[PDB]
Design a binder for this molecule. Structure first.
Ligand SMILES: CCNC(=O)c1cc2c(-c3cc(S(C)(=O)=O)ccc3Oc3ccc(F)cc3F)cn(C)c(=O)c2[nH]1
Length: 106
C-alpha cells in the first residue's frame, strides 16, 4: 500500500496548501497562545506536521491509523473550542475537504 502513498501525495498535500491549514501545521503552542488548560483537556494532541512526519518516517501500521490521526486533529479542535469560533470553522472546512479526498481512497 499504496493507500499510504495517496494520503501523503494527495490528501496531505491538498490540505496543507489550503488557506486555513496554517494553525494545524504544527502542535498547538499553549504557552504562546495563553491556553494553560489545553494540555489538561486534550490528551492526544494531533496536527498535520506530526501526520506528515509519521507518513515520511514509516510510523503507521496502515492508512486507517493515519485517517484516525486526521480525525483526532479535527475532534480535538471541537472538544477544546466553542462552536462558531474561527478555529472551529477553519477545522470544519478542512474536514469537509478531507472527507472528499478520502472518499476517492484506493
Ligand atoms: C478557546 C481558545 N482557543 C484558541 O485561541 C485556539 C487557538 C488555536 C490554534 C492555533 C495555533 C497556533 S500555533 C500552531 O502556531 O501554536 C496559531 C494559531 C492558532 O489559532 C488561531 C489563533 C488566532 C487566530 F486569529 C487564528 C487562529 F487560527 C490551533 N488550534 C488547533 C486550536 O484548537 C486553537 N485554539
Amino acid at each position: 500500500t499504496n493507500q499510504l502513498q495517496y494520503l501523503l501525495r494527495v490528501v496531505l498535500k491538498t490540505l496543507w496548501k489550503h488557506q486555513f491549514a496554517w494553525p494545524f501545521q504544527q502542535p498547538v503552542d499553549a504557552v504562546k497562545l495563553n491556553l494553560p488548560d489545553y494540555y489538561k483537556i486534550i490528551k492526544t494532541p494531533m496536527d498535520m506536521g506530526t501526520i506528515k512526519k509519521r507518513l515520511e518516517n514509516n510510523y503507521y501500521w496502515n492508512a486507517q491509523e493515519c485517517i484516525q490521526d486526521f480525525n483526532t486533529m479535527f475532534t480535538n479542535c471541537y472538544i477544546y473550542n466553542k462552536p462558531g469560533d474561527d478555529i472551529v470553522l477553519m477545522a470544519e472546512a478542512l474536514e469537509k475537504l478531507f472527507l472528499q479526498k478520502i472518499n476517492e481512497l484506493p
